[PDB]
Amino acid sequence: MISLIAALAVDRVIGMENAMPWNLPADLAWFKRNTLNKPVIMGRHTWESIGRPLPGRKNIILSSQPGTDDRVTWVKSVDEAIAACGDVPEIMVIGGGRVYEQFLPKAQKLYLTHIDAEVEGDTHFPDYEPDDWESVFSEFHDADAQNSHSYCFEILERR
Ligand SMILES: NC(=O)c1ccc[n+]([C@@H]2O[C@H](COP(=O)([O-])OP(=O)(O)OC[C@H]3O[C@@H](n4cnc5c(N)ncnc54)[C@H](OP(=O)(O)O)[C@@H]3O)[C@@H](O)[C@H]2O)c1
Ligand SMILES: Nc1nc(=O)c2nc(CNc3ccc(C(=O)N[C@@H](CCC(=O)O)C(=O)O)cc3)cnc2[nH]1
Structure with a gap:
């Protein structure tokens, strides 16, 4: 059972050259x-962004190259990454764009934050056919004193 979890700005932007121009603690x-x-599956670039393992969690990093941090598990392929998670109720793929694209056809659930922010970036969430996905949960939030933009949490489940 694989789930992707991503924060998408307009045009499904999930990343860019620099830090995203927003502050969304929610x-x-x-x-x-x-x-x-x-267990969390991420690409090497996302591993690098995070700086350290997500605590209380198997962290699984895809790299074509051998690993460089023994605190986490390093794998060379999508199928190795899934196998490295073991037998769990739910594997979270936390990105980035190349990893999302490879895991979405395998996934049964998406957790998306849709952020009402206009950014240009080089990396985007894959197109998810809405005939393949049913939105089961949707929860919209205005920007406030803590959150720079409005955003909406959504969970979709594969049909
Ligand atoms: N021309 C471009 O614009 C271009 C192309 C690619 C990446 N990037 C840049 O990199 C940044 C983030 O990209 P992203 O979020 O896509 O990164 P991401 O998924 O977090 O990390 C991608 C890295 O994860 C590893 N990886 C992913 N799938 C794999 C597989 N099936 N087998 C083995 N290794 C795998 C590779 O690591 P190794 O590199 O260690 O093998 C790959 O380079 C962006 O700013 C992006 O523009 C740019
Ligand atoms: N909804 C969603 N929001 C995100 O921010 C997000 N980020 C990624 C990948 N990038 C990152 C970057 C940093 C951290 C991170 O360090 N989070 C810590 C809290 C510490 C902090 O950043 O203040 C964590 O334990 O989650 C996680 C994912 C993947 N999917 C997402 N999905």
Whole structure:
């Protein structure tokens, strides 16, 4: 059972050259509770962004090259990454764009934050056919004193 979890700006932008131009601590909170105690699969670039392992969690990093941090598990392929998670209720793929694209056809659930922010970036969430996905949960939030933009948490499940 694979789930992707991503924060998407307009045009499904999930990343760019620099830090995203926003401050969304509610989305961080959402990511933390939806990934808590689950194995997480990420690309090397996302591994690098995070700086250290997500705590209380198998962290699984895809790299074509051998690993460089023994605190986490390093794998050379999508299927190795899944196998490295073991036999768990739910594997979270936390990105980035190349990893999302490879895992989406395998996934049964998406956790997306849709952020009402206009950014240009080089990396985007894959197109998810909405005939393949049913939205089971949707929860919209205005920007506030803590959150720079409005955003909406959504969970979709594969049909
Ligand atoms: N021309 C471009 O614009 C271009 C192309 C690619 C990446 N990037 C840049 O890199 C940044 C982030 O990209 P992203 O979020 O896509 O990164 P990401 O998924 O977090 O990390 C991608 C890295 O993860 C590893 N990886 C992913 N799938 C794999 C597989 N099936 N088998 C083995 N290794 C795998 C590779 O690591 P290794 O590199 O260690 O093998 C790959 O380079 C962006 O700023 C992006 O523009 C740019
Ligand atoms: N909804 C969602 N929001 C995100 O911010 C997000 N980020 C990634 C990948 N990038 C990152 C970058 C940093 C951290 C991170 O360090 N989070 C810590 C909290 C510490 C902090 O950043 O303040 C965590 O335990 O989640 C996680 C994922 C993948 N899917 C997402 N999905």
